[PDB]
Ligand binder design. Structure first.
Ligand SMILES: Nc1ncnc2c1ncn2[C@@H]1O[C@H](COP(=O)(O)OP(=O)(O)O)[C@@H](O)[C@H]1O
Ligand SMILES: Nc1ncnc2c1ncn2[C@@H]1O[C@H](COP(=O)(O)OP(=O)(O)O)[C@@H](O)[C@H]1O
Ligand SMILES: Nc1ncnc2c1ncn2[C@@H]1O[C@H](COP(=O)(O)OP(=O)(O)O)[C@@H](O)[C@H]1O
Ligand SMILES: Nc1ncnc2c1ncn2[C@@H]1O[C@H](COP(=O)(O)OP(=O)(O)O)[C@@H](O)[C@H]1O
Lengths: 508, 72, 477, 508
């Protein structure tokens, strides 16, 4: 009776808060924390995961929405707008009776009709470079500046078309985003193979490695000593004075094992023996072995070594010795690059060059984070477009045609479910409206123009976010993902039903 | 509508106990502050100046009933 | 004091009765719970909301406990009892106020329940046992409309074996049954279709070192809790002895000298089911030793490791009263529903053995019994007949809430149902729970177990008389 | 800037107050006075004249509605409901900017389309008794108890049919209605010609007289040879004696003229001439007049002379010295009815077969006023129906047809005026919705069934207010007036656009 009204008000408030974010031309919000550090972002997922919401059921909506749509690429803010509009439209009929179950039946029937419509509208144009360009641009211009997105589209699309050779979509490890703080943010490219965070204390050991062999195996040039005896150095410090010694024999054992490894699998000072340590190493043994042609470094994280297993090769055990070099692999180039003060090791052209890392040079922390999120979103969107193989006309093209199909589907359903279907259509109509409003033009001017021209066009058609003119998104380059639409519709219907079925609230 | 029903119910309950030969007597103080004892329902109701319009309707219906039947 | 205490009790009863009166049926509304920290949970189950809600009135606590204890007794119907009790107390409102003592009300309610039992036993259409077609019809009637819509076959077969592997012919003809001796194994892994039934209990534990014999053609399992007992077991020489003590390698060879295979670190949850499956007797006192020390156990055993973990397979038991229903799948989010569904199916089989009947669902049984009482009341006399009619009238609460949480107007539908039902002689017309329209239940294929209906009505009447018997609550605050 | 929210909320509240009044099964409302007087009524024509109206713009709406209804006086409640719904629907689109002027343009276009559509759904046939029975029933069941309308429709249709002169319409004073204080309602009959307000109940009065004649006198016992009446000049010696003999001769001097005037027409007053006086008459002259059948009475209202001038013929001028036989008006059959206390002069077969009077009879005014208002507006409606040559289907059948016409006229309009006409059409559905609500059935379900039936069938399906089912609304005789609908279409639009165009309320 009134719990429904409370939920409606909370959902409308959340929708109104998230109104001015949809679309590339939409403005962006900024997040402030108690510490003082601020984040500047526009993506709905991070906004809902970071906002401090007052109303409880609004927090419910945000949490469940993020949880469900983590599976698909994005569309979070569009989903929130559609569910808010659904609730408002249902309220305009509930306020005069209209028991929520009938509205639920109408919603489910409209969902079925919209699913069939989307199935028969989806366009299966064969994949090429140009379509990937268009998808990357559409998915990137909605998270970062215009020209920055234009620069980043080429990098992301080239990386993704490189990845696509496996004929199966895989992600996470195979694409790595490195972060650094060069002033020139315009520098953004891709590096094949691996890029290591940093190296060790080596004065011009190998540099241009060219051909190399990778064994790693967490070398022990600074093998752990026996420092821990009882708490700390007590009056009985002879343990931490002498027992801490005699472990240099481990370091010399590793040195000699690498010695015959190098002059067994190489036979010359060339062909850099690439090894890594998970902790620091002593410069003495390090440069003594590097002067023999061994590429030894230190202080690397795990993710790089697991990537080395699949992209370079070689086992990795901290406690080890010389063993079968069968696991060892080869690298085309292990050249090291330094920008200003910190060293980057470019492990590229290696065996299985499928693994590729992405390079950005953001000036400060928040721009770096926004760039990382934008490139991740673009990668996910293009991967989904690869997987479905059938892109769909965006810019509100599918939504308006879906609304028209639902309206023409009104007499098909009996009972009072027609009211639910009509409300569902009017709610799905929100997306082009929000696009036009965020762009700056009048709401209903653009909406009426688009509907009127789509009446005779037959083909799908969107909105140009530069003049308000209707535009055929198919021929321009605006594209969305089939799976995104599927998951959005399904989750939207589910959450709308769940909220509408509530009757009363009590404490606990 | 429930307020009108409550008013009529209270008015009926006031004079219900006087029904039949075993009606309780009533202490009737008129406008001019005079003692008066009786059990007739018409006498007290004609003295009862109720305020709710539904009570007015029911009492005037009773008055019309007394007009041509003389009792009940 | 006076009437005020009973009024407070029954008002607290009505509040928690109608807090969830909408929560039953195939179109149940979903309730809204928030704790005072911002945590939010969306619930559609009456037991869960009644558990999480906090109330202080003793009458409300008593009825919540009544519902909770009735939950394990029968399973389904855990909310209809609360609704019925609340409606009966709400109609007893009007008789408590007109100054009649609760004793006559209790007498009238007991007479009404006595008529209830007979009327239910009359109109219930008979149903046979273990026949596949109407058994699956029952499965659709009760188990479905939940998250096992696309996996009903596994629940069906598990229930079909379960109703046959817990048979107890103790004091009659299989009328005794239990729901806790079934060796259920809910192990995640693989497709959900990996579930299967195996005759006889099986144990998640086995010997640490399998350099030894476990399976023998005549497993004489003996329960047991120092080698003196080990070589005193030789009194009959059972092949396998189940105990709860650790066994060493030298102790294991001592067992081999004793022709026994003991086990270690096994809980009573396995031991009792082993005893039920094998039908043995436990004895350890030296003076208690006699010819009855050892009872023959199962008929076979097997050594097998399923899912990279060591199990004990007691297959082909002497008594098929504690068998194994293996269950493998993705996770447990589907199998709790399977457990409650198999419990319901075992109750259905048990009552069909007791009273092979299925009362019509969708309020048809409620309408039939209400019509029976409202026509029988016309003949009998006494001031006690007012509660007798009141309970029958208030029993109409199930169809009204069914129609209410469907969209359709309850009043017109209820009037059409009753007016049709009176002229109808033996029709038992009900209401569709999904569309809110009148339909004969035999056509719609919806039915309800007789035992659960009897339990619900009897428990509701008993709760009503219990809450109307209380004359004061003051013993402190 | 958007300060019209208060105006629109007041309009919505006014609509809510006037809701639950349409249809024969509407809910009656009771009006309490400051002094405690109670009035029972349902018609909005009087219901918009409450003791208080609260909000100012709500009072403005009532003022204009009761100013514009007087042309027809049959759709005040319908007009207010339509205004509330129009404003609410316009609010649904004004919330997102959308300056109201374009909404007014849409309203104008929708009004033009609706007036154009009115010309076809109307049916124009010849009207006779059985046809007017339906009109009287429809216009009367909505303002009186159901059973009483059954006897009053037949009592009014015959009257209006008999008093229809020609194509020229009726006059307001041509029909007069009289009441009494009978305990039982005892149906309602009809009397032709004039009815006396009050007369002299002297026992020698004549009741059954045929072929009579009438004359009116002002004063005959106060001033000699003068028509002025005032207190006797006791202080004046000549005046006191002159008026004492004027008490005797000022009547008889013209009484002899009256008796010779009637006796030359018929010996010894066979025709039985009748006379009426403004005030009382001398008892001796009263007896003298009653002996000859002249029948002297009193209390002649200022309108009776004019009414009998066109009804009983002649001129009932109060000037004395009649002389020539030209002021007398023939009375074909004068009958004196004295039901209970008051005596009434039934002048049958006078010099007019028109100007009848009703015999409405009932209890104390608390309901007699409602009965007289119901018969009054039923007479108004039947007058309009017999005036115009066309009638329209009722029970909201026409409203759904207009809604469908406006919806199918949507593409023909350009710009946001399409949204304006859509809002107007959606607001037009209030009549079936309020009818269903008042009848007790489900609001949206009844309209869903009605629209489903009307979609396939060109017949203007209506609503039956006993089962909540679609009904043809033509053969059932649920016809409503036509000119009322035509005027309502303009009168709703003008006030709607006027209120929607307001801005920045000022405290003058
Ligand atoms: N260049 C463009 N022109 C018009 N519409 C666009 C353009 N780029 C993106 N869009 C629209 O933006 C929508 C996605 O934006 P948004 O929902 O804010 O991002 P997210 O998917 O992260 O929630 C898509 O539906 C698409 O139609
Ligand atoms: N001796 C009696 N026994 C039972 N009922 C009686 C007796 N005398 C009168 N009555 C009842 O009392 C009723 C009328 O009493 P009451 O309401 O006090 O006055 P009124 O006659 O104005 O209604 C009658 O209906 C009659 O049935
Ligand atoms: N699909 C349906 N159609 C009609 N009636 C139903 C349907 N499903 C359940 N019911 C009725 O609802 C009643 C309550 O059952 P249910 O709500 O499933 O469990 P609980 O009794 O624990 O709330 C049953 O008596 C049954 O007759
Ligand atoms: N028998 C009937 N069945 C259905 N509707 C009726 C019937 N009689 C009258 N009506 C409805 O009553 C309405 C007219 O009453 P209304 O306009 O409210 O009078 P007012 O506005 O003067 O109070 C018409 O629209 C007509 O549809």
């Amino acid at each position: 009776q009134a719990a429904l009204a409370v939920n409606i008000s909370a959902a409308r408030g959340l929708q109104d808060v998230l109104r001015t974010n949809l679309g590339p031309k939409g403005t962006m919000k900024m997040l402030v924390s108690g510490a003082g550090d601020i984040k500047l972002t526009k993506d709905g997922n991070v906004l809902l995961h970071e906002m401090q919401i007052q109303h409880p059921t609004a927090s419910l909506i945000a949490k469940v929405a993020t949880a469900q749509d983590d599976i698909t690429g994005d569309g979070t803010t569009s989903n929130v707008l559609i569910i808010g509009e659904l609730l408002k439209q249902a309220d305009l009929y509930i306020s005069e009776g209209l028991h929520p179950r009938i509205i639920t039946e109408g919603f489910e029937a409209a969902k079925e009709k919209a699913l069939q419509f989307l199935e028969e509208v989806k366009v299966s144009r064969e994949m090429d470079r140009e379509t990937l360009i268009d998808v990357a641009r559409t998915s990137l211009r909605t998270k970062v500046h215009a020209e920055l997105a234009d620069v980043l589209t080429e990098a992301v699309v080239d990386s993704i078309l490189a990845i696509k050779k496996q004929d199966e979509p895989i992600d996470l490890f195979m694409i790595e985003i490195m972060e650094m703080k060069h002033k020139s943010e315009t520098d953004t490219s891709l590096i094949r193979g691996l890029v290591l965070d940093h190296g060790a204390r080596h004065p011009d050991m190998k540099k241009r490695v060219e051909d190399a062999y990778i064994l790693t195996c967490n070398v022990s040039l600074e093998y752990e000593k026996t420092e821990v005896n009882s708490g700390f150095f007590y009056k009985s410090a002879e343990e931490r004075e002498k027992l801490v010694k005699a472990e240099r024999k481990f370091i010399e054992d590793r040195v000699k094992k690498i010695i015959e490894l190098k002059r067994k699998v190489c036979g010359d000072s060339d062909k850099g023996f690439v090894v890594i340590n998970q902790k620091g190493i002593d410069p003495f043994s390090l440069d003594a072995l590097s002067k023999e042609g061994i590429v030894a470094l230190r202080r690397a994280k795990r993710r790089n070594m697991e990537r080395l297993t699949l992209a370079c090769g070689g086992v990795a055990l901290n406690s080890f010795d010389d063993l079968s070099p069968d696991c060892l692999g080869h690298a085309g180039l292990v050249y090291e690059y330094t920008l200003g003060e910190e060293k980057f090791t470019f492990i590229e052209k290696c065996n299985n060059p499928r693994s590729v890392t992405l390079l950005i040079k953001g000036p400060n922390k928040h721009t770096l984070t926004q760039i990382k999120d934008a490139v991740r979103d673009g990668l996910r969107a293009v991967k989904n477009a690869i997987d479905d193989g059938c892109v769909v006309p965006g810019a509100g093209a599918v939504e308006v045609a879906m609304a028209e199909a639902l309206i023409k589907h009104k007499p098909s359903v009996k009972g009072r479910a027609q009211l639910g279907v009509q409300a569902f259509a009017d709610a799905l109509l929100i997306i082009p409206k929000v696009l036009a409003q965020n762009s700056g033009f009048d709401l209903q001017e653009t909406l009426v123009k688009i509907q009127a021209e789509h009446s005779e066009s037959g083909q799908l058609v969107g909105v140009d976010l530069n003049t308000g003119e209707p535009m055929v998104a198919a021929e321009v380059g605006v594209w969305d993902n089939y799976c995104v639409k599927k998951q959005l519709l399904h989750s939207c219907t589910v959450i709308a039903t769940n909220i509408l079925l509530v009757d009363e609230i009590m404490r606990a | 509508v429930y307020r009108n029903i409550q008013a009529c119910k209270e008015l009926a309950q006031t004079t219900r106990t006087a029904y039949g030969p075993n009606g309780m007597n009533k202490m009737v103080i008129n406008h001019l502050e005079k003692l008066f004892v009786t059990n007739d329902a018409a006498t007290i109701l004609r003295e009862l100046e109720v305020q709710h319009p539904a009570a007015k309707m029911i009492v005037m219906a009773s008055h019309m009933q007394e007009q041509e039947v003389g009792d009940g | 004091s006076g009437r005020k205490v009973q009024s407070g009790n029954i008002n607290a009863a009505k509040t928690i009765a109608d807090i969830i009166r909408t929560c039953l049926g195939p179109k149940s509304m979903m309730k809204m719970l928030l704790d005072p920290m911002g945590g939010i949970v969306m619930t559609n189950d009456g037991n869960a909301i009644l558990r999480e809600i906090q109330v202080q009135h003793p009458a409300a606590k008593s009825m919540i406990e009544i519902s909770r204890t009735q939950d394990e007794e029968v399973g389904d119907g855990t909310t209809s009892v609360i609704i019925l009790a609340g409606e009966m107390l709400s109609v007893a409102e009007h008789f408590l106020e007109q100054q009649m003592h609760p004793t006559v009300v209790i007498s009238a309610y007991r007479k009404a329940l006595d008529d209830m039992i007979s009327t239910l036993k009359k109109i219930s259409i008979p149903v046979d046992i273990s026949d596949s077609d109407m058994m699956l019809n029952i499965i659709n009637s009760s188990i479905t409309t939940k998250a096992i819509s696309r996996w009903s076959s596994l629940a069906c077969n598990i229930a079909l074996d379960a109703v046959k592997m817990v048979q107890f012919e103790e004091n009659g003809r299989k009328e005794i049954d239990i729901k806790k001796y079934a060796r259920v194994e809910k192990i995640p892994g693989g497709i959900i279709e990996d579930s299967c039934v195996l005759r006889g209990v099986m144990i998640n534990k086995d010997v640490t070192h399998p350099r030894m014999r476990r399976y023998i053609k005549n497993p004489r399992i003996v329960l047991l809790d120092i080698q003196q007992l080990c070589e005193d077991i030789i009194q009959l020489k059972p092949d396998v002895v189940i105990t709860e003590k650790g066994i060493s390698d030298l102790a294991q060879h001592y067992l081999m000298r004793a022709n026994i295979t003991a086990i270690r670190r096994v809980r009573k949850t396995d031991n009792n089911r082993i005893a039920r499956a094998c039908g043995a007797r436990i004895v350890s006192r030296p003076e208690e030793l006699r010819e009855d020390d050892v009872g023959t156990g199962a008929g076979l055993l097997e050594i097998k490791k399923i899912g990279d973990e060591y199990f004990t397979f007691i297959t082909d038991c002497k008594d098929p009263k504690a068998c194994t229903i293996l269950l493998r799948g993705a996770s447990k989010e589907i199998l709790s529903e399977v457990e409650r569904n198999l419990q319901d199916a075992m109750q259905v089989c048990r009552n069909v053995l007791l009273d092979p009947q299925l009362v019509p669902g969708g309020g048809a049984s409620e309408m039939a019994v209400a019509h029976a009482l409202t026509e029988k009341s016309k003949a009998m006399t006494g001031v006690e007949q007012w509660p007798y009619r009141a309970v029958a009238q208030a029993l109409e609460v199930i169809p009204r809430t069914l129609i209410q949480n469907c969209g359709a107007s309850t009043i017109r539908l209820l009037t059409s149902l009753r007016a049709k039902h009176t002229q109808e002689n033996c029709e038992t017309w009900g209401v569709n729970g999904e569309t809110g329209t009148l339909v004969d239940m035999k056509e719609l294929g919806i039915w309800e177990p007789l035992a659960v209906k009897l339990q619900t009505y009897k428990t509701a009447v008993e709760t009503a008389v219990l809450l109307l018997r209380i004359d004061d609550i003051v013993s402190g605050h």
